[PDB]
Each structure stands twice: as structure tokens, then as C-alpha cells.
Design a protein around this ligand. Sequence first.
Ligand SMILES: O=C(O)c1ccc(-c2nn(C(=O)c3c(Cl)cccc3C(F)(F)F)c3ccccc23)cc1
Length: 260
Amino acid sequence: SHMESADLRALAKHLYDSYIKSFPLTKAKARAILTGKTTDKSPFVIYDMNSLMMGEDKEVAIRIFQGCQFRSVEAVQEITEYAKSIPGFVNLDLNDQVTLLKYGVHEIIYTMLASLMNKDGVLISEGQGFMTREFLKSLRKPFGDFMEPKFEFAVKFNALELDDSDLAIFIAVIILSGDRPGLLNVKPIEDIQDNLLQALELQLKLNHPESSQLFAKLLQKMTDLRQIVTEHVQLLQVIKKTETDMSLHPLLQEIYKDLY
Ligand SMILES: O=C(O)c1ccc(-c2nn(C(=O)c3c(Cl)cccc3C(F)(F)F)c3ccccc23)cc1
């Protein structure tokens, strides 16, 4: 209810530490890759079909779609370990830990995706590649239209100009949302988020002290995320059943066997 400001500072730096350990490609590292001047640091830019074939690390848009699906699985493992480091998380009912992560990973993936994006494209692989926004938008339906809304949210979110020490607490606040459906013990979850919200508010005042009501803007983006993500998972499920389930395309299988 009323943590001391020193306690909130320690909580913030503990979260920053585990954030650095779980997520190797921080926003700071991604920004430096995006502005490097050498070819050694340079990510290979994929801007059309020929450039994509040269990058070594619908066959194409489905491979791209399944490529990001795999990266989200790796992100979940990293988010789960970071969530285990939030003080008091592992003391909750094991099913509430699952519920909180179940609804939370999709919102965190959207947020951390902004860390890899600018107005022109997105860092992919582990910073070794860069896919342009217009290439991904050009992908045949429904892939082109499924990926563009991520860019549209990122340029808004990145305008808030948050760093890793900010995102560490923001991600934790998302995870400890007491109003997820199906939660058993709500009060202990809210008691943790009350402390994280205090720690978040203090961090956004020490950082960005000229920035007016950044705490409020960030909270509004957070609830915006939930509606955005509900639509994202629903269309993602549609795409996974009508486009990547080869058992539903028996004639494409015959083509593949007859041509390859
Ligand atoms: O970690 C990575 O290398 C990485 C990781 C993710 C992307 C990327 N995913 N994505 C999706 O829409 C997406 C897809 Cl297509 C399938 C499953 C899940 C997602 C999700 F991340 F949104 F949740 C994008 C859209 C626009 C731009 C970049 C990306 C890109 C790179």
C-alpha cells in the first residue's frame, strides 16, 4: 500500500536486472544495431522476394508467419523466467501464474516488438536481419494485413520514448493484472501490482522528468493493448487453421508431391 521510495527504487533495479538476463536483445541494443555504421554490425535488409532468399539465418509468407510464431514461443520462455523473478509471483497459486502468463504474453510480445521496430521496418532473428514495413505489408492476404497493425501500434508506443529500465516495470505491471478471467486469488495479485504501479510511477518521474503525465499515457496504452490483442489472437487462430494446416489442403499436398 505504501512502500518507501527506497524500496520502490530497489524493486525497479531488481526488475531491470532480471530483464537484462531474460531478454538478450534489449531496446538499447536494438537501437544501436539500427543506427550502426559498419557492415559487421549491419543487419541484412529484406525488402523484396529476391532479398529474402539471400538472407540465411505461399511458401514465403507462411514461412515468415511460422518464423515469427517460433520466435514468440522463445519469447514466452524468456517472459516466463522474468515473471518468476517478480517478487511474490511464484508465491501465487500455480494456476493463477499460468492464467496471468496466458493472457499476458501476447500483450508483452506486442510491446517488446516495438523495441525492434522503427517507421521503416523491424529487426528480426537476433538483430541479424531487418524486414521492411512495406515488404511485410505487401505479403498476400491475410498475412500483409495481419502484420501491419503491429507497426501501427509501435510508432505510437515508441513515441513515449521509454527505455529498458522503464519497460522492465511496465512489463511486470501487465503480468500482474488482477482482472484476468479465471483467476482464483485476486487480492494477492493486486497487492503485487499496487507495488509495481508505485515503482513504475516513481521510475517515470526520475526518468523523463520533463514528460507530463507519461504514467497516465502509458496506462492508457496498456488497456488499449488488451482490445488490440484480443483481435490479434482471434485472427491469428483463423490464419493458423485456414492457411498453415496442410491437412485442410489435400490438393496442394498433391501438387507438392507431384512437383517437388
Ligand atoms: O524475434 C523476432 O525476430 C521477431 C518476432 C516477431 C516478429 C513479428 N511477428 N509479427 C506478428 O504479427 C506475429 C506473427 Cl506473423 C506470428 C505470430 C506472432 C506474431 C506476433 F508477434 F505479433 F505476436 C510481426 C508483425 C510485424 C512485424 C514483425 C512481426 C518479427 C520478428
